[PDB]
Symmetry: C5
Subunit: 203 residues, 5 copies
């Protein structure tokens, strides 16, 4: 049964084509769950963090009738289209720490949540104060403009207490995740991003 | 065992039957994955940042009975590249570096369908390093389980709950192991409401005096 | 969506990733413009810099063009499906690290747009970086193997302080970035090779 | 034979034959006997030594040989040897039991296949190990032991044999910070409670000191 | 279309894993390093970190074509070609290739391959801080093909590399000599050819 679902997905999946339905934007939901803050440099304004990037979207062409079969399977992301997300202020490659598999649900939803370690250029001033530093990370589709891909945050506000390591030397005060849009003279179109504002301080 | 043509044929059979991307479940039962870490070394410890850099053998076994063959007159086991096999998608929940596999990526397939895979892995973790310079030592806990398969699909079974690991740990390390416990645990999160099984590995160690 | 899959199919039937898309014995005209985002490390002793930049790169392959009167005007395409110019920095001292998805945009008129974010280290003049007038670090980028009859390189934005792109959190600030056509020839390699010479004039803040 | 060694078409046909016959994932056991693998490390350099952590960072040529007689051909009027990418060949799954880094292969991953079926593979490798560095600053020096054998094949499938005493002076960099006093390489066997079979290894004892 | 056809021809005739011996002679490989930079130098450990262009040429006449009315050269991914299995005998890191892995193929069958490489070596760094400078020697040749199969020739035996060497290095090149040499080790009962590169340099 599971082999048959994987076969179906592979027959139907077009890994290089955005799964647009009726010419509508593909809605990509994104939420960073911070796990650790490993290194912070107040002189260079850089941070080194680990987060789970909870990512979901739909490709209805993948759906199947699961009334008498599995309603989810794990799938190598190499078999799937996946959004071309990138952080605008990353200064290192995203290092994926976990198996590169997504879940496909029988209604066509795709769930992908890598643990990623990555370095960013952001405002680290105030990290050793009670009110803390606020490091902003902007994440969006690198090449698809707003007509093609829309990015939506899932949880606008959280202290992340469920996910964050208790052994970090930093503690998280608040994480806000809000829709935002960028445009540059290089690239006329509007591009959606989620702006992740990480408010943290040294313990 | 050393009948070459027999081995080539067994490998051919395994490749015909094996489906590397499909969990080898039967009748909607979870795949039971047994896990035991054998610590070989503790390379770096930072008590300020609560990080450790360690080397361990991850003894992992499970069954896929469709792989089985009659070995009354043929090899009992063969080595097989893991790229030809389904392998559980295990990950450490508090890892802060990629697992660095130090050994050839081969598993053993046994004629009863058991698969045995035991990579030597170097990896860094965020865990409690406080006390490492005391008699009582630090206790660093590491949780390992399937990243994407919940408890109805994969279960994780420890095989060696309690040990001092004296058989495996390097005598030349800066550190010594006091106790290692490996126990069943499960996690659940708001993001992912299913239950996920793991083995919780508690490494009690200290700097040698 | 089937329109988009069809476009990707057409591109792949027509694309020859290993063949330069010359038209009528003309060089392939490649436009290149570096948008600096950050300056991460500078060493005045060794004269080395570690920088992040978006490499805005464009060119045309008119064989890829399609009538888009009733279909998408552009699609994203993995660069492995396309010919891409073999650009390299002549004074790079590390591999270019691409920090972004390796996708290009293909426009229905046959224009290809590729803009990776790259982190890379260079040997250049860092002297004067702690002064008001700053350092001027020059970076030369051109085709590694194709000479000027085969690829030409043109800068698109010859002068800018780059304020739109540069990180406000860097400990450095950019005074000016100039980008100009240049060509080089060595006795090893007796053709003229075109490049863009990028002059990054920057200084430490404060 | 010598006169035909550079006959290109012959070399191409030999490569074809090898790829037709080779089974890269199957141990080339003959006569229900273990595959005899010979291993000899030629130390080229000792790059870093830590007395506190008991770690070394070394470069060595790992001279490795075995036979697969199904690859043999008649070289009376053809090349005696060709270079072959190791991806076309079975290679022993050797690993160092006390390695703490991946083996970094510094050379092209090509082996030689000889017309009698012998395979010769000799990568230059940079790797770090956990071993006894105590005494490195003394005249007697330190003795660092490296144990290398098949990771997954037990003694009935693969045996390992040292190719056993040298100062490696032919190979070792005259410019190193250290000097080699002696290198002995001896057959050995290990077994662990995880893994009930016996596994063969070569134990390489590197006696070295700071200059 | 002409270039696509030349690439198809090269791929039809190229044997990427077979040495292109012509007329039962060794493949004559020319090798010349152009030093671009000297990045780090350690007088205690006798190690250097350098960047060089490795100009490498050889012939495979089976790749030739009539270029009377077609391009004289094309760029080709080296994965489509045989390339000599060159290695440095005293390298202590992997060669890091900094440039696109393409070679030029000339219509007379000459192949030209010149990667920029960053690599670290074990060599004599003594005297680097003196007027006479250090002399770091680097030997590069085929790893697995002995002299009957591959020969290696230097192209410029003497030069100060002023065309190539970075103006902004902390070091300067006094002289670069590149000569034919052969090595024989007890492990391996044949002679292997190499280019011995002597890099005489000093701190500024
Ligand atoms: C773009 C864009 C937006 C703005 C910069 C990052 N995402 C683009 C255009 C063409 C090719 N690649 C990327
Ligand atoms: C999950 C999960 C829990 C939390 C990490 C592992 N178990 C998940 C869900 C969907 C896709 N990838 C991972
Ligand atoms: C060349 C060149 C010029 C000079 C270095 C980069 N562009 C070349 C020739 C043959 C093979 N590879 C590169
Ligand atoms: C083994 C073994 C020997 C003893 C430990 C290392 N080599 C083994 C068994 C099953 C799977 N992988 C490795
Ligand atoms: C050899 C050789 C010479 C001496 C070391 C480098 N080149 C060789 C023989 C068999 C397999 N691999 C390398």
């Amino acid at each position: 049964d599971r082999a048959d679902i994987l076969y179906n997905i592979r027959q139907t999946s077009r890994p290089d084509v955005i799964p647009t339905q009726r010419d509508r934007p593909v809605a990509v939901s994104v939420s960073l769950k911070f796990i650790n803050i490993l290194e912070v440099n107040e002189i260079t304004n850089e941070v080194d963090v680990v987060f789970w990037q909870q990512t979901t979207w739909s490709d209805r062409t993948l759906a199947w009738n699961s009334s008498h079969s599995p309603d989810q399977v794990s799938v190598p992301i190499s078999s799937l289209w996946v959004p071309d997300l990138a952080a605008y202020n990353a200064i290192s490659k995203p290092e994926v720490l976990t198996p590169q598999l997504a879940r496909v649900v029988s209604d066509g939803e795709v769930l992908y949540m890598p643990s990623i370690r990555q370095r960013f250029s952001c405002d680290v001033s105030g990290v050793d104060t009670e009110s803390g530093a606020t490091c902003r990370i902007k994440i969006g589709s690198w090449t698809h403009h707003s007509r093609e891909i829309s990015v939506d945050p899932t949880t606008e506000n959280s202290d992340d207490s469920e996910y964050f390591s208790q052994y970090s030397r930093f503690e998280i005060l608040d994480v806000t995740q809000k829709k935002n849009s960028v445009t540059y003279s290089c690239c006329p179109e509007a591009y959606e991003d989620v702006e992740v504002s990480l408010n943290f301080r040294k313990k």
